[PDB]
Structure 1
């Protein structure tokens, strides 16, 4: 609805799950697809194969509301962050800006411990 067609996508991908969400210019949220939401569970959500079809099921419900141009907000250092963008162009959008905004601190707090395994 209202056919803005100038959206902002969002990319977040840990070592164990990924979420893509496509919003407005600012953006207020429109449609989002998660690797857990597409039937996958547990540990297999880490793989880059989910990042294709999560992006596809995001873009379908996205451009039902009418969507041509897009911004690419990249958080979440994981695995399929590049596959999500490459399948994002494969369903016909206007990726032209790559910002891998990874929030790094300046030694504020302390990390958790090692994993004595």
Structure 2
């Protein structure tokens, strides 16, 4: 109901960026996305859309009550820095930043190349 510390996960792919503020235990608190803010097609992948989504999720989390968060970035999306700066500007204190992009140690076979 009221929190002080949290984790902001930014899953930013080439098509869309989702921002999810959870408690330190991984229980979701608030979330937003470029698609959730009405952006469509290319705009969903733009850095600006990441900024707006991060702002909205930050506002919801802060209304829930939240001062500091640590950021976990995932995916190769371009909007990661935009979302981070959006969080900081909106107020959440970004204590630490980490990249959690999955890196298979070979493992599973990826799909075929496009246009072949």
TM-score range, shorter chain: over 0.9
Structure with the bigger percentage of strand:
2
Structure with the higher helix share, 1 or 2: 2
Q: Distance in 2 between matches of 1:76 and 1:53?
A: 18
Q: CA deviation at 1:89?
A: 0.2
Does 1:104 pair with 2:103?
Answer: yes
Q: Per the alignment, in what secondary structure is the counterpart of residue 50 of structure 2?
A: helix
Say which SS state the counterpart of residue 23 (structure 1) adopts: strand
What stretches of structure 1 move > 6 A for 4+ residues in a row? Answer: none
Note if contact 2:68-2:93 (Cα within 8 Å) is conserved in structure 1. Answer: yes
Q: CA deviation at 1:116?
A: 2.0
Q: CA deviation at 1:103?
A: 1.0
Q: Distance in 2 between matches of 1:105 and 1:81?
A: 21
Task: Note the residue ranges of structure 2 that are not aligned, 5 or more in a row.
Answer: none
Cα-to-partner distance string for 1:10-66 (whole Å, 9 max, x where unaligned): 110111111000011112011101110101112221110101111111011111111
The alpha carbon displacement at 1:101 in A equals 1.4
Are 2:16 and 2:34, in contact at CA under 8 Å, matched by a contact in 1? Answer: yes
For 1:15, the equivalent position in structure 2 comes to 14
Offset, 1:93: 1.5
Q: TM-score, normalised by structure 1?
A: 0.93
Q: Where do residues 35-74 of structure 1 align in structure 2 (5 Å cutoff)?
A: 35-74=34-73
- TM-score, length of structure 2 as denominator length: 0.94
In 2, Cα distance between the equivalents of 1:110 and 1:27?
A: 30
- Distance in 2, Cα, partners of 1:15 & 1:32: 19
